[PDB]
Amino acid sequence: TTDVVVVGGGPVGLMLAGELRAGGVGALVLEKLVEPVGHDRAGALHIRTVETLDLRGLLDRFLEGTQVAKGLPFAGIFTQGLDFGLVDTRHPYTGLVPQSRTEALLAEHAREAGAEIPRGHEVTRLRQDAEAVEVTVAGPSGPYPVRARYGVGCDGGRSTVRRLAADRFPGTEATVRALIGYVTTPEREVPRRWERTPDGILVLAFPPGWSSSSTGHSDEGPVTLEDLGAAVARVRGTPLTLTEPVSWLSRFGDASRQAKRYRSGRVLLAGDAAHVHFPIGGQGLNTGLQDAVNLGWKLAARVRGWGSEELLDTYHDERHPVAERVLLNTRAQLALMRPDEQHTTPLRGFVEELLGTDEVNRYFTGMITGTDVRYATFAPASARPHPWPGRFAGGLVLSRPSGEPVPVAELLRSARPLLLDLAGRADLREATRPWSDRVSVVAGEATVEPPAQALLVRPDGYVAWAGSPAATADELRASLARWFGPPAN
Amino acid sequence: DVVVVGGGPVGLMLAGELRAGGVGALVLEKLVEPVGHDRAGALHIRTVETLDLRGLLDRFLEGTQVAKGLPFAGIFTQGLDFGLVDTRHPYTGLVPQSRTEALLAEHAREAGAEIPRGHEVTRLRQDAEAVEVTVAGPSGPYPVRARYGVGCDGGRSTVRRLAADRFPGTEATVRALIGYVTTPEREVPRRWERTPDGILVLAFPPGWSSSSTGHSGPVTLEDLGAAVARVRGTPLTLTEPVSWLSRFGDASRQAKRYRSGRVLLAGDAAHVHFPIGGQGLNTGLQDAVNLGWKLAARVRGWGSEELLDTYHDERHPVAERVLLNTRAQLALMRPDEQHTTPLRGFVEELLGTDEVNRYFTGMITGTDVRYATFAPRPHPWPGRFAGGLVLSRPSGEPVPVAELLRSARPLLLDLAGRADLREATRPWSDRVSVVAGEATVEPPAQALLVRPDGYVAWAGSPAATADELRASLARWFGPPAN
Ligand SMILES: Cc1cc2nc3c(=O)[nH]c(=O)nc-3n(C[C@@H](O)[C@H](O)[C@H](O)COP(=O)(O)OP(=O)(O)OC[C@H]3O[C@H](n4cnc5c(N)ncnc54)[C@@H](O)[C@H]3O)c2cc1C
Ligand SMILES: Cc1cc2nc3c(=O)[nH]c(=O)nc-3n(C[C@@H](O)[C@H](O)[C@H](O)COP(=O)(O)OP(=O)(O)OC[C@H]3O[C@H](n4cnc5c(N)ncnc54)[C@@H](O)[C@H]3O)c2cc1C
């Protein structure tokens, strides 16, 4: 009676709302807070994310803010930063876009897309039936129930929705404290502006923003200014700090927890509600948005009819393995940034040396920026899959008449699966007539590397099925029926 | 002639190289009955390659070496693959240090070097022409004069003390107790490394080792049981007669100068590190071979002062890195499940990469060592190791350059055909010119002035004139004949 209800007006939530509308489904976002607050957590959108935004024509809107970094760094190692030039991408850079500004854009997009955004409605409880779900809400006018076919949790890390459906979501206890907060130019008139990793902690100051991580800290009331000064026990000179009017200033730990199932019947999880990690390398919102886009088109499909149950299960099948690795890279990154001068500095030396290597630099570059993600869904047996299944195609360019460059990124904005003819294969095209909602665009791309004559491309940029010369129409027939349900009458 | 202090491996080796170099060698060893037992050894490729240059390799292969090769920092899934590095000997010699000393001693005995076992050194004194060491023998004290004195004792080298060299380094914060014991309790435990939270243990028979991170008289058996606080089940242990059993720390100290006038340092007397990856004796023996021929030369006349200075210039940078790799290795070896396990995962993944596996493989086994001495740009072969090349020429018979260096003399390999260079090398004494063909030469090379230690001193591309080589010889091996 109200299609799909997403809980949380965060980035992930707004994104998911857009993809649901772009997918022809009613979206409803209930956001706890009333006046959005990003401030801290100042954001940074990496390549795979940026590439993804291009598939939605949203990239143009984010480039008014001067992104940059081509790119680096990694675990406080600056001498040999991550070089984006080593990975195949049409967008070899990161969008330095403050999360506050990001939410602003995503909200505006969902508003115009036709999705209600009541800001100021916390969710008290839930209840999952066999056909639909009901969420108890607490609005200014007062409480009220709400029915919808599916409910997705896109709130914070303390997701109530995760609680109310019981999902754990194990993870590790925090042993790293990190206090941050903006406080411009109090004492000293031009200290320093380096990261610096003393013995006892690692600080990061800036004047004409302070950040301090302590390793080995597990009753506490909210965090105070004087709380931050002593936290700078890592430095000799004791600025602390001072005032200097306060701004935001928060505290963060290195608990690495993650939902054991992204799905529980007809409840789903995304963004921080599904994975929680230390804020190192700015992978949080990146992983979230991509979770959203991966689910959006899949869920919208399930609702409208063609989206099968198997299809929805793949959301977790694909996105869980990804976040696992994020939690791990952040935990290992912390090991590399450890405040030990006796073993860890030596190690950092060697590691910096390997970041000089293209092979290894490309590796960590891929891990962080997301370019390394490839899915493994709906593989046959016995008949090994093509080299293109799961690979990302959102960054290809086509041509054909006149030799005009035609970005596949622009063709996915329709939010519909594609079939790229690349070479010339009409047998496959004709086998795809019965669709609705898959379009067949004909072109001619030489790469195709490894070679490929056809690419069944998902709404999210990733390839679902790929065709070599030997691929018959009958093979593709089944691949469509499985990915996008039965043909027309 | 020359007095080396210490009947350890390094000391015995150095003795041999001095005799092979035509100089009198005298080894004074503190202890009377040699004791290796613990520290069970392992000789890696560059070392093995080095032993081949001395025809000693044949004698060490009666014991079944092995490992082709691995592991690395307790990471077994993806061990170091020796097959990725260019070498005629892609393996490590699993030769117990006790057995090793046995061989090296026997070799020096027959080479003509006195080995009085049971003569500690009380003090020293360095003149302008010679050095005198005060000794404490069974018959009683006595002074001893020699042109040069090399310290090849333990890590607590008195010789290092008596010449004042520091030798900074870091304080130990890692305790490691080891000791042979069986079958103390249980007839069914395990045989894995295992890295718990709190420490990392390593048990065996049906051989105990326990490292604790965060600990700053003599060590007892009951001392070892509690050290196994890292494990739940408390074997501890028990007795089961004892055997050796010692304690070791991770202090990473190293001499600030391998040379002080006419005193020299080698082996543990020059570098000290945690026993991880068995790089201790390896680095030592190579120190010895690098010094041996250089020092023997200085004594006999042709060995210049500049030449002897290069011993430190070359060998110091090497041990620095060893200390560092061991310290970083310890960082990789836990005992943190919260950050360090995750890191080990990624690192294991990179050890799957050939490029990276080749890297760590080179670092450990020594294959990555290349010197940078007497540069004018230099050829691609200066400093590179040549001891593993094969020659041919008539009949097409394989002729290992390893076999030609046993004479302990510098060589000049003609490879291609360059007589202008040969004729320019007639005046020597003690450099020999062997003619042969080798297509590799990779990067290409027509001539290779090879040091007694396997490493290339000077290399020749077609453009290299006789005049260039002329100077290169005069600098490396002193003036020509009359
Ligand atoms: C210091 C720091 C620096 C960071 N830097 C980067 C970076 O550079 N690049 C990058 O990509 N990521 C970065 N991150 C990641 C970070 O921004 C988060 O991971 C990201 O905001 C998560 O997306 P989300 O929408 O799911 O979370 P949120 O934004 O927290 O979603 C919260 C929303 O749902 C909330 N909510 C909670 N409970 C309910 C309920 N019961 N009912 C209704 N609503 C509810 C609402 O309050 C709401 O505003 C950083 C994080 C930190 C702490
Ligand atoms: C548990 C353990 C395991 C190891 N495993 C390996 C491995 O697998 N591979 C590897 O390459 N290395 C390994 N090592 C390193 C180890 O073998 C040393 O590097 C080697 O013993 C040092 O050689 P050395 O001769 O210079 O010192 P030593 O062997 O200690 O020689 C010292 C000798 O001179 C001593 N001496 C001291 N003072 C005097 C004096 N005043 N007068 C006369 N003599 C004196 C005598 O005691 C004497 O026996 C290991 C070390 C330990 C502790």
Side-chain angles (χ1 to χ4, degrees), chain A residues 2-18 20-29 31-34 36-40 42-60 62-63 65 69 71 73-89 91-118 120-121 123-124 126 128 130 132-133 135-145 148-176 178-181 183-186 191 193 195 197-198 200 202-205 207-209 211-216 221-225 227-233 235 237-239 241 243-260 262-309 311-358 360-381 383 385-399 401 403 405-409 411-432 434-437 439-444 446 450-452 454-476 478-489, chain B residues 1-27 29 31-32 34 36-38 40-61 63-64 66-67 69 71-87 89-105 107-108 111-113 115-116 118-122 126-131 133-144 146 148-155 157-160 162-165 167-170 172-174 176-179 181-184 187 189 191 193 195-196 198 200-203 205-207 209-221 223-229 231 233-235 239 241-246 248-255 258-261 263-319 321-354 356-376 378-392 394-422 424-425 427-429 432-434 436-437 439-441 443-466 468-469 471-481:
Chain A
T2 322
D3 261 346
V4 169
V5 171
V6 60
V7 203
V12 180
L14 298 179
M15 178 66 65
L16 185 64
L20 288 172
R21 285 303 302 182
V25 167
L28 180 55
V29 195
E31 146 93 51
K32 176 175 175 173
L33 282 74
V34 182
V37 262
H39 57 291
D40 70 338
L45 313 166
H46 295 123
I47 58 199
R48 182 44 55 78
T49 301
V50 166
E51 288 181 320
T52 275
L53 289 196
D54 199 359
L55 283 37
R56 283 294 168 281
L58 287 182
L59 191 51
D60 293 358
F62 288 66
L63 283 238
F74 179 80
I77 303 188
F78 297 94
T79 43
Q80 293 281 354
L82 301 182
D83 183 14
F84 294 162
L86 306 182
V87 278
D88 188 18
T89 176
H91 311 264
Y93 57 98
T94 67
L96 299 188
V97 195
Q99 189 170 336
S100 43
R101 196 216 196 206
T102 303
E103 292 179 18
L105 305 186
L106 292 184
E108 204 66 8
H109 179 88
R111 152 215 166 106
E112 290 157 327
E116 225 213 316
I117 31 84
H121 307 234
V123 169
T124 315
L126 259 87
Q128 192 188 171
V133 188
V135 284
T136 305
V137 195
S141 312
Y144 59 55
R149 223 197 172 260
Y150 291 91
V152 186
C154 290
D155 33 15
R158 304 176 199 193
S159 175
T160 57
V161 187
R162 185 179 64 251
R163 156 188 313 112
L164 304 182
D167 262 338
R168 203 171 170 283
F169 193 76
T172 61
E173 335 298 337
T175 57
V176 164
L179 316 178
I180 91 180
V183 358
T184 59
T185 184
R193 293 199 151 208
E195 145 152 321
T197 49
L202 76 92
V203 66
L204 177 151
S211 178
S212 182
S213 317
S214 294
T215 288
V223 67
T224 174
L225 179 53
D227 230 338
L228 180 48
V232 185
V235 192
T238 321
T241 335
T243 281
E244 243 294 303
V246 169
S247 277
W248 31 295
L249 106 80
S250 308
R251 99 214 308 185
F252 302 111
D254 70 320
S256 294
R257 315 194 81 83
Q258 178 196 14
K260 190 150 195 187
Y262 278 55
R263 178 177 188 190
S264 182
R266 30 183 85 253
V267 181
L268 298 167
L269 299 179
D272 282 12
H275 35 79
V276 149
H277 45 83
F278 192 89
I280 179 69
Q283 311 170 294
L285 195 160
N286 276 346
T287 311
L289 289 192
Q290 292 170 26
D291 276 346
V293 161
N294 183 299
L295 182 60
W297 72 273
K298 290 180 180 176
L299 193 53
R302 173 58 196 171
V303 164
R304 301 199 83 261
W306 81 84
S308 75
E309 283 288 334
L311 175 74
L312 192 60
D313 290 351
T314 77
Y315 163 71
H316 158 110
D317 290 0
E318 295 180 346
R319 300 311 296 175
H320 188 80
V322 163
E324 305 181 20
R325 157 158 293 237
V326 171
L327 307 200
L328 269 54
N329 89 43
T330 56
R331 295 175 48 178
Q333 223 159 319
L334 285 170
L336 276 197
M337 300 185 69
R338 186 179 177 97
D340 172 34
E341 292 288 326
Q342 185 143 349
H343 310 291
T344 295
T345 293
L347 180 69
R348 290 175 63 85
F350 292 108
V351 165
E352 176 218 318
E353 184 167 342
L354 300 177
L355 286 159
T357 304
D358 281 0
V360 170
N361 189 297
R362 190 179 293 115
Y363 174 85
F364 292 106
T365 295
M367 173 187 307
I368 300 302
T369 69
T371 33
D372 69 350
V373 309
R374 184 206 283 166
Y375 307 128
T377 333
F378 294 35
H386 197 261
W388 273 89
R391 188 165 172 164
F392 183 64
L396 291 185
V397 197
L398 298 180
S399 42
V406 174
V408 49
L411 307 181
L412 288 167
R413 292 166 189 189
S414 64
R416 305 180 39 148
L418 275 44
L419 184 77
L420 324 180
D421 194 7
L422 301 188
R425 225 158 184 292
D427 52 351
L428 298 182
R429 300 178 184 182
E430 297 197 348
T432 312
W435 332 68
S436 148
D437 204 282
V439 301
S440 308
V441 55
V442 316
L455 292 182
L456 180 52
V457 178
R458 294 151 52 157
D460 54 11
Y462 296 87
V463 184
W465 174 89
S468 171
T472 71
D474 215 36
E475 294 176 3
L476 169 56
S479 194
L480 290 162
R482 192 183 183 193
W483 274 103
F484 315 105
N489 31 306
Chain B
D1 253 346
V2 168
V3 171
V4 60
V5 203
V10 181
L12 297 179
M13 179 67 64
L14 186 63
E17 295 301 310
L18 288 172
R19 285 303 303 181
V23 167
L26 179 55
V27 195
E29 146 94 50
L31 282 74
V32 182
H37 57 291
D38 70 338
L43 314 166
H44 295 122
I45 58 199
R46 183 44 57 78
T47 302
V48 166
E49 291 182 317
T50 276
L51 289 197
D52 199 0
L53 281 38
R54 283 293 169 282
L56 287 183
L57 191 49
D58 293 358
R59 291 200 166 254
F60 287 66
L61 283 239
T64 275
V66 147
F72 180 78
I75 304 188
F76 297 93
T77 43
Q78 294 280 354
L80 300 183
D81 184 14
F82 296 163
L84 308 182
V85 277
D86 189 18
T87 175
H89 311 263
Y91 58 98
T92 68
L94 301 187
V95 197
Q97 188 170 336
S98 42
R99 196 216 196 206
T100 303
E101 291 178 19
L103 304 186
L104 293 183
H107 180 87
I115 31 84
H119 307 234
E120 202 185 16
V121 170
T122 315
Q126 192 189 171
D127 285 356
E129 299 170 343
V131 188
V133 284
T134 304
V135 194
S139 312
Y142 58 56
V144 169
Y148 291 91
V150 187
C152 290
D153 33 15
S157 175
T158 57
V159 187
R160 185 179 64 250
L162 304 182
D165 263 337
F167 193 77
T170 62
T173 56
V174 165
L177 315 179
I178 91 181
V181 172
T182 19
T183 196
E187 197 47 32
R191 292 200 151 208
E193 144 152 323
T195 49
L200 76 92
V201 66
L202 178 151
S209 177
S210 182
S211 317
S212 293
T213 288
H215 283 96
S216 33
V219 67
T220 175
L221 180 52
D223 231 337
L224 180 48
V228 186
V231 193
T234 321
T239 281
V242 349
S243 276
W244 31 295
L245 105 80
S246 308
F248 303 110
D250 70 318
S252 295
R253 317 195 79 84
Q254 180 195 13
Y258 278 56
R259 179 175 188 191
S260 182
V263 181
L264 299 167
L265 299 179
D268 282 12
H271 35 79
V272 149
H273 46 82
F274 193 87
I276 178 70
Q279 313 168 292
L281 195 160
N282 276 346
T283 311
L285 289 191
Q286 294 172 24
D287 276 345
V289 162
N290 183 298
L291 181 61
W293 72 272
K294 289 179 181 177
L295 192 53
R298 172 58 196 170
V299 164
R300 301 199 82 261
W302 81 84
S304 76
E305 282 289 334
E306 181 182 21
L307 177 74
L308 191 60
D309 291 350
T310 77
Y311 164 70
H312 158 110
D313 290 359
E314 294 180 347
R315 300 312 294 175
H316 188 79
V318 163
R321 155 161 296 237
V322 170
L323 306 201
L324 270 53
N325 90 45
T326 54
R327 293 174 49 180
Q329 224 157 318
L330 283 169
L332 275 198
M333 298 185 70
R334 340 223 43 42
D336 172 35
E337 293 288 327
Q338 186 143 349
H339 310 290
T340 294
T341 292
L343 179 69
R344 291 173 67 85
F346 293 105
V347 162
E348 177 218 318
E349 182 166 344
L350 297 179
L351 288 160
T353 302
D354 281 359
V356 169
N357 189 297
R358 190 178 293 116
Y359 175 86
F360 292 105
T361 294
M363 171 190 309
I364 300 301
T365 68
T367 33
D368 67 351
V369 310
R370 182 207 284 166
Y371 306 130
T373 332
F374 295 33
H379 198 261
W381 273 89
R384 186 165 173 164
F385 183 64
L389 290 185
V390 197
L391 298 180
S392 42
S395 169
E397 43 150 340
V399 174
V401 47
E403 312 188 344
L404 307 181
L405 288 168
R406 293 165 189 190
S407 63
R409 303 180 40 149
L411 277 43
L412 183 77
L413 324 180
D414 195 6
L415 302 189
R418 225 157 184 292
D420 53 352
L421 298 183
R422 300 177 184 183
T425 312
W428 332 69
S429 169
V432 301
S433 309
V434 55
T440 290
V441 174
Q446 287 184 331
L448 292 182
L449 180 52
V450 177
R451 296 149 54 153
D453 54 11
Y455 296 87
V456 184
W458 174 90
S461 172
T465 69
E468 293 175 4
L469 168 55
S472 194
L473 290 162
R475 192 181 183 196
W476 274 102
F477 315 104

